[PDB]
């Protein structure tokens, strides 16, 4: 705010003081009443909203989805910001000459796999049955390119059909 | 420049103090030199609300202090026109009613209208008289004030408008009534005129010595008598 | 907002009224330092960033929405609560016509863009229903507009469904 | 903010008024321009952000992942903050002596199961096939401990293999 200087000997002292008090009163954010605040407001410390909090484009600036269109086996992406990843591989298959096959997701260097749910299949030779696999990854960093693949836990692979890996990114 | 439109330029940053500080009923006088270097306003196009005005806004729109500008200066182009107007401060509005200061013009009709205007020495002062151009209190210097005083006596109550009728001396003193200068003299005496009855006043004098002004003297207080 | 008393030339307690106005402004204003409590509905025109600990009440009510069909589980019909991004999962179980191939997905409503799709494939085991879940992500969902996500078929013939359930997550935009 | 008192007859009235006006002008949060605000700011009423809302560590502060490592059938956790749960049980199995088996997730006392997608399996005796189950749970409260198990809707259980229950927690 641009206030007019109050000096000894000035003319229009009362009005300039009045205008300055009025300027300050109308430009300042106050501890009461409904208001509208313009400008980029950066808060250093903690902020708490007891009432109803409302924001624009939440899903765009916090949730990011990256999946491989042409293969669905390996997803390669440049992280938009710091985040937590939720990798799901929608696989369908059979174990080599029937029987056991367990699939998961590889943990890239610099990432920590919090939890893992492996996808198991048995019997039904040369027929592909649902076997989805899921894992949660923490410490994904801005600009750093990451690659999540299909890892094998136990058993042999017979052959995949219609695979699709989806990556959810909960911004940190 | 405009077509079926109001065109304005904000003058708000050129008014020392907000118009809600002026007391209702007080007079203020506006004076300005104006020149039109180009005037391209066709047949169908009409000029309206052409002025420099301080006014109330939403709901009210009532003028506080204004001056109309020439509605058709086409036959007086490239000439300095001095325009003066005394305005009476209107009564206060609701506190919710705001103010603004604008140079406005309205171009209405089929074709676009435009002009180029030069504005020299704009002035607004308290009072009913457009006195000589002066800068603001915050920008004024010793040099900006009159240097010579002229006097003559015994004639009719009204004063001559011929410089030669007066006896001209270089002023050696400046007389300040309530902080503002009201004149001066070569002599060690000055007559304070046009005062109001039963009111207290303060006067202080300074010495002039060719654009070198002394610090102001110690103030002295007096009170005009009350009439019967 | 605050109620200041006008400062005029000739007023009676000029110094004292200026002091009270300065004190009023000093105690009612939000300042660039210290812990404070701010009342009233505060609408920010520009960008807002919180470097410290941001606390908001009811985040899942405010920003997430779950809609699913109870009585059928194949067609979810809902009126969008706010501008969102949809995450549709159809928990299907079935078999292909007289055994063999069957691939299922989710239909893209007009005005929506299907970002990614993971189809659900099944083979053999005639007149026995095996897990075959399908998932797809949808963008450009608008406030108060009604949408309908169904079961689409990519490749093969449908034999018969059993225990289907479509769930829709809505991440507010 | 410490303003210097304006009193009747004070020596540097003009100078002190200017000073106090300048102090107020530089220390106050205003309705215009880009600024940086320090201190814990608690808002009693509603708050709306029309512009871009930047949040430090959103992921950790609004999302929580809890899963059982050693068993994968029963997840037991203390709710960090009042929330909404999204329980997924990545099961693989077969019905007793072949045939039907339908699995779900139990609703703890004080919780409301919004929606439920049960996991069905048929035939393929003593061979474990994918049969994932999902359910959404509302009204989770700060500090109270919860336990989500495997419930059976219709049919007999033969035997599980590679189970893993994951619990997403959206703060509310």
XYZ file of C-alpha atoms in Angstrom:
745
model
C 0.000 0.000 0.000
C 1.177 3.519 -0.925
C 0.623 5.866 2.050
C 1.226 9.633 1.883
C 3.997 10.779 4.319
C 2.888 12.690 7.470
C 5.461 15.417 8.219
C 5.832 18.321 10.719
C 4.470 21.509 9.169
C 2.518 19.774 6.394
C -0.653 21.109 4.891
C -3.745 18.921 4.938
C -2.506 16.963 7.957
C -5.965 15.892 9.211
C -7.145 14.720 5.777
C -3.862 12.953 4.923
C -4.007 11.131 8.332
C -7.690 10.296 7.620
C -6.956 9.008 4.107
C -4.027 6.917 5.401
C -6.150 5.372 8.198
C -8.925 4.723 5.633
C -6.369 3.193 3.132
C -5.005 0.825 5.803
C -8.533 -0.095 6.956
C -9.744 -1.056 3.426
C -6.539 -2.793 2.089
C -5.814 -5.020 5.137
C -6.967 -8.615 5.773
C -8.780 -8.595 9.128
C -9.596 -11.108 11.933
C -13.401 -10.699 11.259
C -15.969 -10.534 8.394
C -16.226 -12.012 4.877
C -13.407 -10.915 2.509
C -11.707 -11.459 -0.848
C -7.864 -11.529 -0.915
C -5.869 -11.061 -4.154
C -2.211 -11.902 -4.818
C 0.044 -14.939 -4.398
C -0.162 -15.832 -0.679
C 2.731 -18.004 0.619
C 2.364 -19.193 4.264
C 5.684 -20.043 6.082
C 4.100 -21.759 9.107
C 1.150 -24.090 9.800
C -2.361 -23.295 8.454
C -5.614 -24.744 9.871
C -9.162 -24.275 8.429
C -11.948 -25.099 10.975
C -14.663 -24.228 8.416
C -15.242 -25.579 4.923
C -12.030 -25.730 2.864
C -12.480 -25.443 -1.008
C -9.807 -25.700 -3.756
C -9.455 -25.690 -7.592
C -8.047 -28.505 -9.882
C -7.252 -30.940 -6.958
C -7.211 -34.162 -9.015
C -4.954 -32.564 -11.673
C -2.264 -31.205 -9.292
C -2.225 -34.193 -6.806
C -3.349 -37.349 -8.713
C -1.307 -38.486 -11.837
C -1.967 -41.609 -13.970
C 0.792 -43.132 -16.210
C 0.275 -46.441 -18.115
C 1.845 -48.210 -21.139
C -0.549 -48.245 -24.152
C 1.437 -50.433 -26.621
C 2.658 -53.208 -24.259
C 1.196 -53.001 -20.707
C 4.266 -54.910 -19.293
C 6.516 -51.889 -18.303
C 5.534 -48.240 -17.467
C 8.237 -45.545 -17.938
C 7.455 -41.969 -16.742
C 9.068 -38.717 -15.464
C 7.546 -38.024 -11.948
C 5.747 -34.597 -12.023
C 6.642 -33.889 -8.334
C 7.604 -35.692 -5.047
C 5.051 -38.516 -4.458
C 3.807 -41.964 -3.325
C 3.053 -44.515 -6.156
C 0.267 -47.181 -6.257
C 1.196 -49.714 -9.051
C -1.443 -52.305 -10.302
C -0.619 -54.802 -13.109
C -3.828 -56.227 -14.697
C -2.352 -59.522 -15.931
C -4.028 -62.728 -17.315
C -2.089 -65.987 -17.902
C -1.099 -69.615 -17.091
C 1.931 -71.382 -15.539
C 4.410 -73.334 -17.784
C 2.617 -76.677 -18.737
C -0.078 -75.881 -16.140
C 0.410 -75.248 -12.437
C 1.991 -72.493 -10.299
C 3.069 -68.946 -11.366
C 3.349 -65.926 -8.984
C 3.798 -62.327 -10.334
C 4.663 -58.962 -8.718
C 6.246 -55.540 -9.455
C 10.023 -54.552 -9.360
C 11.197 -51.852 -6.854
C 13.341 -49.123 -8.609
C 16.555 -47.853 -6.902
C 15.765 -45.034 -4.449
C 12.197 -46.381 -3.806
C 10.778 -48.367 -0.857
C 8.033 -50.963 -1.452
C 5.701 -50.503 1.583
C 3.361 -53.479 0.792
C 2.984 -56.130 -1.976
C 0.079 -58.365 -3.066
C 1.349 -61.008 -5.531
C -0.814 -62.573 -8.290
C -1.071 -66.391 -8.232
C -2.411 -68.846 -10.912
C -2.676 -72.723 -11.113
C -3.630 -75.323 -13.785
C -5.714 -74.459 -16.938
C -2.793 -74.925 -19.460
C -2.822 -72.622 -22.597
C -5.855 -70.631 -21.227
C -5.297 -67.169 -19.580
C -7.062 -66.512 -16.195
C -7.081 -63.229 -14.106
C -4.046 -62.841 -11.784
C -3.750 -59.092 -10.789
C -0.699 -57.850 -8.773
C -0.407 -54.657 -6.609
C 2.362 -52.801 -4.652
C 2.756 -49.381 -2.892
C 6.024 -47.374 -3.432
C 7.279 -44.364 -1.384
C 9.886 -41.636 -1.972
C 9.288 -40.865 -5.694
C 11.081 -37.544 -6.565
C 10.436 -34.591 -8.986
C 11.999 -34.901 -12.466
C 13.395 -38.412 -11.687
C 12.340 -40.965 -14.358
C 11.009 -44.314 -12.945
C 10.368 -47.793 -14.521
C 8.052 -50.453 -12.925
C 8.265 -53.961 -14.503
C 6.816 -57.502 -13.989
C 8.857 -59.551 -11.459
C 8.398 -63.294 -10.755
C 8.203 -64.523 -7.088
C 7.711 -68.344 -7.453
C 7.102 -70.718 -10.385
C 7.589 -70.566 -14.166
C 5.868 -68.350 -16.716
C 3.819 -69.985 -19.467
C 2.530 -66.989 -21.412
C 0.771 -63.629 -20.846
C -2.440 -62.246 -22.510
C -4.059 -58.723 -22.317
C -1.643 -57.157 -19.687
C -2.090 -53.530 -18.460
C -0.072 -51.699 -15.763
C -1.605 -48.503 -14.234
C 0.374 -46.056 -11.963
C -1.538 -43.733 -9.500
C 0.615 -40.912 -8.052
C -0.523 -39.372 -4.692
C 1.567 -36.157 -4.644
C 3.801 -35.480 -1.597
C -11.304 7.344 -28.976
C -14.602 5.475 -28.883
C -17.719 4.230 -30.724
C -21.013 4.306 -28.680
C -18.962 4.432 -25.545
C -17.784 6.285 -22.487
C -14.006 6.786 -22.542
C -12.215 7.771 -19.335
C -8.673 8.152 -17.872
C -8.286 7.902 -14.069
C -7.224 11.227 -12.448
C -7.458 9.742 -8.925
C -3.693 9.816 -8.348
C -3.667 13.567 -8.946
C -5.919 14.609 -6.035
C -3.982 15.401 -2.806
C -6.894 14.386 -0.549
C -10.056 12.261 -0.841
C -13.277 14.146 -1.632
C -15.073 12.872 1.447
C -12.836 15.206 3.515
C -14.300 18.334 1.908
C -17.119 19.831 4.150
C -20.551 20.039 2.330
C -21.404 23.584 1.190
C -17.753 24.675 0.887
C -16.660 25.957 -2.531
C -13.664 24.722 -4.531
C -12.465 26.285 -7.797
C -10.987 24.344 -10.729
C -8.785 26.095 -13.368
C -6.981 24.467 -16.373
C -5.294 25.296 -19.745
C -6.514 23.020 -22.527
C -5.512 22.550 -26.209
C -7.009 20.432 -28.946
C -4.427 19.443 -31.535
C -6.793 17.066 -33.407
C -10.602 16.777 -33.445
C -12.034 13.858 -35.514
C -15.714 13.723 -34.578
C -18.025 12.950 -37.553
C -21.604 14.100 -38.343
C -23.522 11.312 -36.560
C -21.201 11.382 -33.527
C -22.232 13.344 -30.411
C -19.992 14.468 -27.514
C -21.544 14.159 -24.035
C -20.399 14.183 -20.332
C -17.118 15.789 -21.334
C -15.492 16.832 -18.053
C -12.749 16.430 -15.323
C -14.690 15.392 -12.268
C -14.461 14.112 -8.666
C -17.791 12.352 -7.940
C -19.651 9.704 -5.897
C -19.921 6.283 -7.563
C -22.434 3.340 -7.383
C -26.004 4.394 -6.630
C -25.225 8.158 -6.360
C -23.010 9.352 -9.276
C -23.544 12.925 -7.861
C -20.661 15.355 -8.735
C -18.472 16.674 -5.922
C -16.072 18.941 -7.833
C -16.107 19.190 -11.613
C -15.179 21.248 -14.750
C -16.817 20.931 -18.189
C -14.450 20.775 -21.175
C -15.293 22.233 -24.652
C -18.024 20.151 -26.359
C -16.792 21.319 -29.893
C -13.394 23.029 -30.142
C -13.091 22.358 -33.910
C -13.003 26.067 -34.774
C -10.434 26.793 -31.963
C -7.798 24.066 -32.625
C -4.183 24.485 -31.512
C -5.080 27.275 -29.060
C -4.724 27.326 -25.248
C -8.116 27.735 -23.678
C -8.235 28.654 -19.937
C -11.362 27.080 -18.339
C -12.552 27.874 -14.759
C -15.483 26.602 -12.598
C -16.435 26.951 -8.901
C -18.148 23.896 -7.393
C -20.218 23.557 -4.159
C -19.494 20.377 -2.135
C -22.679 18.244 -2.044
C -23.982 16.735 1.235
C -22.397 13.473 2.436
C -23.848 10.197 1.046
C -24.101 6.789 2.840
C -20.549 5.640 3.929
C -21.011 2.659 1.584
C -21.095 5.158 -1.378
C -17.605 5.500 -2.840
C -15.863 8.198 -4.925
C -13.662 8.521 -8.094
C -11.798 11.236 -10.083
C -11.915 10.927 -13.883
C -11.402 12.724 -17.183
C -14.455 11.473 -19.131
C -15.989 11.859 -22.632
C -18.810 10.001 -24.406
C -18.893 9.305 -28.140
C -22.341 8.213 -29.303
C -23.659 7.686 -32.793
C -22.886 5.643 -35.925
C -19.187 6.538 -36.360
C -16.166 6.560 -34.082
C -15.118 9.860 -32.611
C -11.657 10.859 -31.366
C -9.619 13.896 -30.296
C -6.177 14.741 -28.889
C -6.038 17.124 -25.941
C -3.186 18.794 -24.100
C -3.728 19.612 -20.426
C -1.478 22.316 -18.856
C -1.370 23.610 -15.223
C -4.549 21.882 -13.826
C -5.592 23.407 -10.485
C -8.110 22.844 -7.750
C -8.187 25.201 -4.765
C -10.398 25.939 -1.795
C -12.469 29.021 -2.520
C -14.631 30.847 -5.104
C -11.702 32.369 -7.079
C -9.307 30.768 -9.615
C -6.104 32.392 -8.320
C -2.746 32.082 -10.195
C -1.355 28.623 -10.841
C 0.571 27.245 -7.889
C 2.008 23.768 -7.283
C 0.835 21.700 -4.268
C 1.921 22.444 -0.631
C 4.268 19.442 -0.741
C 5.971 20.657 -3.952
C 5.966 24.506 -3.447
C 9.299 26.415 -3.003
C 10.155 30.102 -2.138
C 10.581 30.872 -5.902
C 6.918 29.920 -6.682
C 5.435 32.906 -4.814
C 4.940 36.549 -6.029
C 8.160 38.662 -5.703
C 6.655 42.213 -5.978
C 3.787 44.064 -4.202
C 1.795 46.967 -5.680
C -0.200 49.545 -3.703
C -2.455 52.566 -4.253
C -5.076 54.285 -2.006
C -8.272 56.420 -1.466
C -10.184 55.383 -4.654
C -13.524 53.431 -4.884
C -13.877 50.190 -2.743
C -13.071 48.030 -5.857
C -9.374 47.529 -6.960
C -7.841 48.537 -10.365
C -7.053 45.837 -12.947
C -4.209 47.950 -14.517
C -0.680 47.136 -13.267
C 0.456 50.791 -13.755
C -2.178 52.158 -11.236
C -0.049 50.529 -8.423
C 3.289 51.475 -6.715
C 5.510 48.384 -7.183
C 8.123 47.304 -4.571
C 10.230 44.118 -4.137
C 8.750 42.275 -1.147
C 11.101 41.903 1.859
C 8.524 39.930 4.014
C 6.000 37.032 3.689
C 2.905 36.933 5.915
C 1.491 33.490 6.855
C -2.022 33.385 8.313
C -2.669 29.949 9.885
C 0.252 28.345 8.062
C -0.681 29.598 4.520
C 0.822 32.777 2.872
C -1.682 35.577 2.273
C 0.732 38.240 0.944
C 3.703 40.333 2.003
C 5.327 43.792 1.998
C 8.476 46.008 1.699
C 7.366 47.693 4.970
C 7.476 46.264 8.539
C 3.602 46.176 8.654
C 0.798 44.334 6.756
C -3.022 44.504 6.755
C -4.827 41.162 7.225
C -8.157 41.431 5.399
C -11.329 39.297 4.695
C -11.320 37.642 8.146
C -14.524 36.287 9.761
C -15.953 37.747 13.040
C -15.284 36.269 16.477
C -12.653 33.783 15.249
C -9.117 33.085 16.589
C -6.196 33.424 14.151
C -2.391 32.818 14.123
C 0.089 34.878 12.139
C 3.816 34.423 11.626
C 6.118 36.403 9.233
C 9.312 35.432 7.368
C 11.946 37.633 5.591
C 12.696 37.391 1.851
C 16.110 38.220 0.361
C 16.011 37.103 -3.301
C 14.683 33.491 -3.148
C 16.377 33.110 0.315
C 13.553 32.939 2.876
C 14.242 33.096 6.619
C 12.730 30.564 9.054
C 9.208 31.702 10.038
C 8.890 34.011 13.101
C 7.333 32.974 16.435
C 3.551 32.872 15.949
C 1.273 35.538 17.459
C -2.418 34.932 18.233
C -5.384 37.290 17.932
C -9.180 37.083 17.722
C -11.489 39.211 15.529
C -14.157 41.141 17.448
C -17.857 40.169 17.341
C -20.330 42.578 15.612
C -23.545 44.073 17.201
C -14.282 -3.616 7.581
C -13.151 -2.142 11.063
C -15.097 0.923 12.341
C -12.720 3.940 12.523
C -13.763 7.376 13.798
C -13.134 10.164 11.179
C -10.154 12.504 11.735
C -11.146 16.068 10.815
C -9.428 19.490 11.200
C -10.819 21.225 14.307
C -11.977 17.983 15.996
C -11.844 17.760 19.818
C -9.681 14.803 20.807
C -7.504 14.515 17.732
C -4.456 12.837 19.331
C -6.634 10.427 21.355
C -8.880 9.500 18.299
C -5.741 8.931 16.113
C -4.388 6.694 18.934
C -7.623 4.710 19.156
C -7.793 4.263 15.347
C -4.145 3.047 15.273
C -4.868 0.686 18.167
C -8.073 -0.620 16.432
C -6.145 -1.326 13.190
C -3.272 -2.963 15.112
C -5.550 -5.452 16.963
C -8.034 -6.306 14.099
C -5.478 -6.906 11.283
C -3.954 -10.240 10.193
C -0.174 -9.815 10.421
C 2.871 -11.417 8.680
C 4.064 -12.949 12.050
C 2.820 -14.806 15.168
C 0.007 -17.280 15.872
C -3.517 -15.842 15.260
C -7.181 -16.740 14.856
C -9.040 -15.331 11.796
C -12.867 -15.157 11.613
C -15.062 -14.759 8.489
C -15.287 -16.386 5.034
C -11.867 -15.835 3.411
C -11.879 -16.131 -0.426
C -8.407 -16.036 -2.082
C -8.329 -14.734 -5.728
C -4.695 -15.767 -6.405
C -2.423 -18.750 -5.655
C -2.004 -20.031 -2.051
C 0.949 -22.158 -0.805
C 1.314 -23.719 2.698
C 4.971 -24.595 3.554
C 3.973 -25.682 7.084
C 1.383 -28.163 8.307
C -1.885 -27.714 6.346
C -4.972 -28.841 8.242
C -8.410 -29.103 6.595
C -11.607 -30.613 8.072
C -13.473 -33.526 6.280
C -11.077 -34.115 3.276
C -12.783 -37.376 2.005
C -16.380 -35.871 2.198
C -15.132 -32.695 0.447
C -12.860 -34.297 -2.279
C -13.780 -38.072 -2.791
C -17.103 -39.697 -3.943
C -18.107 -43.378 -4.184
C -21.051 -44.457 -6.404
C -22.063 -48.083 -7.116
C -25.191 -50.042 -8.199
C -26.595 -52.154 -5.299
C -29.379 -54.116 -7.099
C -27.587 -55.022 -10.374
C -23.838 -54.167 -10.372
C -23.439 -53.650 -14.189
C -24.740 -50.080 -14.772
C -23.886 -47.230 -12.376
C -26.039 -44.097 -12.936
C -25.161 -40.959 -10.857
C -25.341 -37.120 -10.781
C -21.675 -35.832 -10.383
C -21.317 -33.947 -7.015
C -18.557 -31.615 -8.300
C -16.054 -31.332 -11.268
C -14.084 -34.647 -11.114
C -11.897 -37.460 -12.561
C -13.520 -40.981 -12.391
C -11.830 -44.358 -11.626
C -14.301 -47.140 -12.699
C -13.681 -50.822 -11.590
C -16.130 -53.622 -12.560
C -15.714 -56.690 -10.285
C -17.028 -59.303 -12.728
C -16.969 -63.161 -12.647
C -17.959 -65.307 -15.669
C -17.246 -67.641 -18.633
C -17.126 -67.316 -22.447
C -19.929 -68.737 -24.702
C -19.556 -72.615 -24.635
C -16.096 -72.123 -23.049
C -13.201 -70.073 -24.411
C -12.487 -66.352 -24.941
C -14.402 -63.318 -23.513
C -12.905 -59.811 -22.952
C -14.795 -57.120 -20.932
C -14.311 -53.358 -20.389
C -16.216 -50.133 -19.548
C -18.115 -47.767 -21.997
C -16.923 -44.123 -22.428
C -19.894 -41.644 -22.045
C -20.173 -38.691 -24.502
C -18.094 -35.724 -23.282
C -15.630 -38.010 -21.382
C -12.092 -39.134 -22.289
C -10.902 -42.636 -21.304
C -7.238 -42.026 -20.275
C -6.305 -45.747 -19.787
C -8.090 -49.167 -19.954
C -7.281 -52.609 -18.467
C -9.644 -55.233 -19.992
C -10.757 -58.447 -18.201
C -10.037 -61.726 -20.055
C -11.356 -65.303 -19.386
C -10.885 -68.727 -21.168
C -12.398 -72.257 -20.841
C -14.230 -73.536 -17.675
C -17.772 -73.624 -19.287
C -20.788 -72.840 -16.954
C -18.403 -71.926 -14.042
C -17.691 -68.214 -13.227
C -13.999 -67.162 -12.699
C -12.649 -63.661 -11.672
C -12.156 -61.251 -14.626
C -11.986 -57.628 -13.224
C -11.913 -54.607 -15.615
C -10.687 -51.007 -14.930
C -10.637 -47.622 -16.788
C -9.851 -43.968 -15.891
C -12.205 -41.152 -17.120
C -11.541 -37.381 -17.256
C -13.716 -34.281 -17.821
C -16.676 -35.053 -15.489
C -18.765 -31.882 -14.677
C -20.750 -30.749 -11.526
C -24.446 -31.778 -11.416
C -24.232 -33.673 -14.773
C -25.597 -37.241 -14.913
C -23.296 -40.068 -16.155
C -23.722 -43.831 -16.953
C -20.857 -46.427 -17.079
C -21.799 -49.850 -18.526
C -20.128 -53.210 -19.450
C -18.629 -53.171 -22.985
C -17.259 -56.226 -24.857
C -13.823 -55.985 -26.635
C -13.357 -59.519 -28.144
C -15.284 -62.812 -27.899
C -18.831 -63.940 -26.944
C -20.460 -63.598 -23.501
C -21.644 -66.789 -21.809
C -23.104 -65.504 -18.548
C -22.228 -63.229 -15.600
C -22.296 -64.005 -11.789
C -21.822 -61.632 -8.749
C -20.967 -58.398 -10.719
C -20.201 -55.097 -8.875
C -19.127 -51.775 -10.426
C -17.517 -49.174 -8.073
C -16.808 -45.567 -9.103
C -14.227 -43.430 -7.262
C -14.376 -39.666 -7.907
C -11.233 -37.548 -7.352
C -12.454 -33.898 -7.206
C -10.879 -31.477 -9.723
C 3.120 -5.051 16.919
C 4.297 -2.363 19.318
C 2.980 1.092 18.275
C 4.178 4.203 20.141
C 1.274 5.975 21.933
C -0.125 9.186 20.356
C -0.918 11.614 23.212
C -2.163 15.224 23.598
C 0.770 17.634 23.710
C 3.403 15.079 22.656
C 6.549 16.634 21.130
C 6.917 14.568 17.845
C 3.259 13.903 17.041
C 3.566 14.139 13.251
C 6.713 11.914 13.246
C 5.196 9.288 15.580
C 1.890 9.175 13.582
C 3.899 8.644 10.365
C 5.917 5.921 12.087
C 2.874 4.027 13.399
C 1.166 4.233 9.963
C 4.380 2.920 8.328
C 4.684 0.079 10.954
C 1.063 -1.019 10.295
C 1.558 -0.787 6.506
C 4.625 -3.100 6.495
C 3.483 -5.708 9.134
C -0.102 -6.318 7.842
C -1.301 -9.033 5.408
C -3.088 -7.165 2.604
C -5.850 -7.881 0.017
C -3.301 -7.231 -2.842
C 0.167 -8.296 -4.031
C 2.434 -11.330 -3.508
C 3.401 -11.923 0.165
C 4.980 -14.343 2.644
C 3.125 -14.952 5.965
C 4.773 -16.480 9.080
C 3.031 -18.009 12.136
C 0.239 -20.528 12.819
C -2.863 -19.116 11.074
C -6.144 -20.631 12.395
C -9.271 -19.850 10.294
C -12.620 -20.072 12.228
C -14.838 -19.830 9.090
C -14.812 -21.097 5.482
C -11.721 -20.710 3.213
C -11.729 -20.830 -0.616
C -8.678 -20.818 -2.956
C -9.561 -19.865 -6.586
C -5.875 -20.006 -7.641
C -3.224 -22.760 -7.467
C -3.099 -24.480 -4.033
C 0.450 -25.776 -3.161
C 0.615 -28.352 -0.282
C 3.700 -29.697 1.522
C 3.682 -33.526 1.942
C -0.072 -34.038 1.073
C 0.454 -37.812 0.594
C 1.718 -38.615 4.142
C -0.684 -36.100 5.836
C -3.950 -37.227 4.093
C -3.233 -40.848 2.904
C -2.251 -43.953 4.996
C -1.526 -47.560 3.928
C -1.893 -50.449 6.430
C -1.495 -54.150 5.509
C -0.616 -57.446 7.272
C 2.847 -58.701 6.195
C 2.965 -62.128 7.934
C -0.594 -63.398 7.228
C -2.527 -61.142 4.783
C -5.997 -62.106 6.129
C -6.498 -59.757 9.154
C -5.276 -56.117 9.186
C -5.173 -54.525 12.670
C -4.318 -50.758 12.933
C -4.835 -47.550 15.010
C -6.557 -44.789 12.809
C -4.079 -41.822 12.602
C -6.919 -39.297 12.043
C -10.774 -39.502 11.505
C -11.164 -40.958 7.937
C -12.658 -43.207 5.161
C -11.178 -46.726 4.487
C -10.851 -48.559 1.107
C -10.204 -52.295 1.908
C -9.013 -54.724 -0.892
C -8.260 -58.427 -0.124
C -6.046 -60.007 -2.855
C -7.142 -63.636 -2.335
C -6.551 -66.826 -4.436
C -8.354 -70.137 -3.721
C -10.916 -72.901 -4.459
C -14.315 -74.004 -3.044
C -14.458 -77.173 -0.847
C -14.220 -80.240 -3.190
C -14.626 -77.841 -6.148
C -17.518 -75.482 -6.838
C -18.855 -72.248 -5.282
C -17.143 -69.928 -2.715
C -17.884 -66.161 -2.251
C -15.615 -63.906 -0.083
C -15.926 -60.341 1.307
C -14.761 -58.086 4.198
C -16.313 -57.765 7.775
C -17.776 -54.386 8.908
C -16.409 -53.363 12.402
C -18.844 -51.904 15.015
C -19.247 -48.115 14.531
C -18.434 -48.344 10.760
C -20.743 -48.216 7.713
C -19.931 -50.307 4.609
C -20.902 -47.966 1.712
C -20.368 -50.537 -1.133
C -19.124 -54.173 -1.485
C -17.775 -56.217 -4.428
C -17.559 -59.923 -3.426
C -15.024 -62.426 -4.872
C -16.512 -65.584 -6.490
C -14.769 -68.884 -7.555
C -16.033 -72.230 -9.092
C -14.502 -75.692 -9.864
C -10.689 -76.319 -10.230
C -10.348 -78.397 -6.963
C -6.994 -78.059 -5.016
C -5.770 -75.278 -7.424
C -5.955 -71.581 -6.306
C -7.459 -69.036 -8.804
C -7.735 -65.185 -8.395
C -10.864 -64.032 -6.491
C -10.239 -60.415 -5.229
C -12.779 -58.698 -2.872
C -13.294 -54.914 -2.196
C -15.412 -52.715 0.182
C -15.547 -48.991 1.233
C -15.860 -48.073 5.020
C -16.923 -44.686 6.489
C -16.810 -43.094 9.966
C -13.300 -44.158 11.074
C -12.239 -42.142 14.179
C -8.862 -40.747 15.414
C -6.987 -43.038 17.792
C -9.466 -45.930 17.794
C -8.158 -49.366 16.700
C -9.896 -51.280 13.835
C -9.801 -54.913 12.468
C -10.933 -55.969 8.920
C -11.224 -59.738 8.326
C -12.341 -62.207 5.573
C -16.132 -62.861 5.667
C -17.970 -65.568 3.660
C -21.193 -64.641 1.734
C -22.215 -67.960 0.023
C -20.624 -71.423 -0.260
C -17.880 -73.454 1.490
C -14.173 -72.621 1.827
C -11.636 -75.131 0.504
C -8.305 -73.419 1.160
C -6.516 -70.061 0.648
C -3.084 -69.330 -1.029
C -1.029 -66.035 -1.233
C -3.620 -63.680 0.471
C -2.889 -59.926 0.959
C -5.230 -57.283 2.434
C -4.358 -53.580 1.741
C -6.179 -50.683 3.577
C -6.050 -47.164 1.979
C -7.008 -44.334 4.397
C -8.402 -41.075 2.929
C -8.386 -38.528 5.878
C -11.878 -36.995 6.827
